[PDB]
Amino acid sequence: PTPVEEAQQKTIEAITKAINYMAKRRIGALLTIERDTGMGDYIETGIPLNAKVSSELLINIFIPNTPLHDGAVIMKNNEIAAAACYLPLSESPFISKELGTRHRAAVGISEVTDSLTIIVSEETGGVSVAKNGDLHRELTEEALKEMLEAE
Amino acid sequence: PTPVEEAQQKTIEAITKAINYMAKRRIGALLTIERDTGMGDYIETGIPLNAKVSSELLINIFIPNTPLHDGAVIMKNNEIAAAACYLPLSESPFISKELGTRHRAAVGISEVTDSLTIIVSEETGGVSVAKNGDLHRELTEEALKEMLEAE
Ligand SMILES: COc1cccc(C(=O)n2cccc2)c1
Ligand SMILES: [Mg+2]
């Protein structure tokens, strides 16, 4: 594999390890991966990080009662661009009624970009992904990893 | 002021805001600012960030009982280079005997570099600075700012 491909694999490994840990601990999380539609307008609403990705940094961002935990992390390739970002809220009727703002924000950004957003529920620990206006819930660890690899 | 001057002042303000937050909550912290002596060997022992400085990120790094909080943050060229870094423990017999390994690590790096290290005590929330092999204890906010500006 090329350096670009190896870097992508390392970033996938960092994301999945972080998400798997937050799911086990019921740590709510909202992580949007920019794709070909630029998300600068949303990145600029958060706290700039421009940080190398690591599982450790991803988890710490979302620890409850901390400055960075409310709002979305937006990643650009192999960097965490910003945290505590605003995303627009979807009004889609296909969002389970019991779900809160993180899931609605994820679907919302997925309606106006080609990004992939991962959500961890603080209520159940369930992991979901929003893409192209659809929310896919209750993902296994294997399914999430495959989704990211395909992305 | 010049761009460089404004950037230095912004970073000092971000540091002092984070230190004040951790002192109030008695969150142990260890933050070393690289100066003329290169610290790459110590940076390489931690988790790479190369992140923009913010008080928010500093606070979200230093969360008790997290891997990212286990060691020193090292700053270089107005960025957070890495977190959870190793620093050498001082063997000086002239450090206050009630202080533990955090303060000995700060003094230790200050014995072999021209860096400035800030320490927040998890026992008391007291703020200290290590430079040139000495520990300056029980600093006020004004005292810490003066040290950062002098540095
Ligand atoms: C010690 O419990 C914690 C608490 C918060 C964050 C982490 C962490 O950074 N990781 C967990 C698995 C890989 C990375 C661990
Ligand atoms: Mg299902």
Swiss-Prot record, chains A, B:
Coiled coil: none annotated. Disruption phenotype: Increased sensitivity to the beta-lactam antibiotic cefuroxime (CEF), upon overexpression of the c-di-AMP phosphodiesterase GdpP greatly increased sensitivity to CEF. Double disA-cdaA mutants cannot be made, suggesting they are lethal, while double disA-cdaS and cdaA-cdaS mutants are viable. Depletion of cdaA in double disA-cdaA deletion cells leads to cell lysis. Exponentially growing cells are extremely sensitive to H(2)O(2), no change in response to methyl methanesulfonate. The keyword RNA-binding does not apply. One of its GO terms (molecular function) is diadenylate cyclase activity. It comes from the Bacteria. It is a multi-pass membrane protein. This is Cyclic di-AMP synthase CdaA. The lineage of its organism: Bacteria, Bacillati, Bacillota, Bacilli, Bacillales. The chain holds residues 103 to 252 of 273 of the full protein.
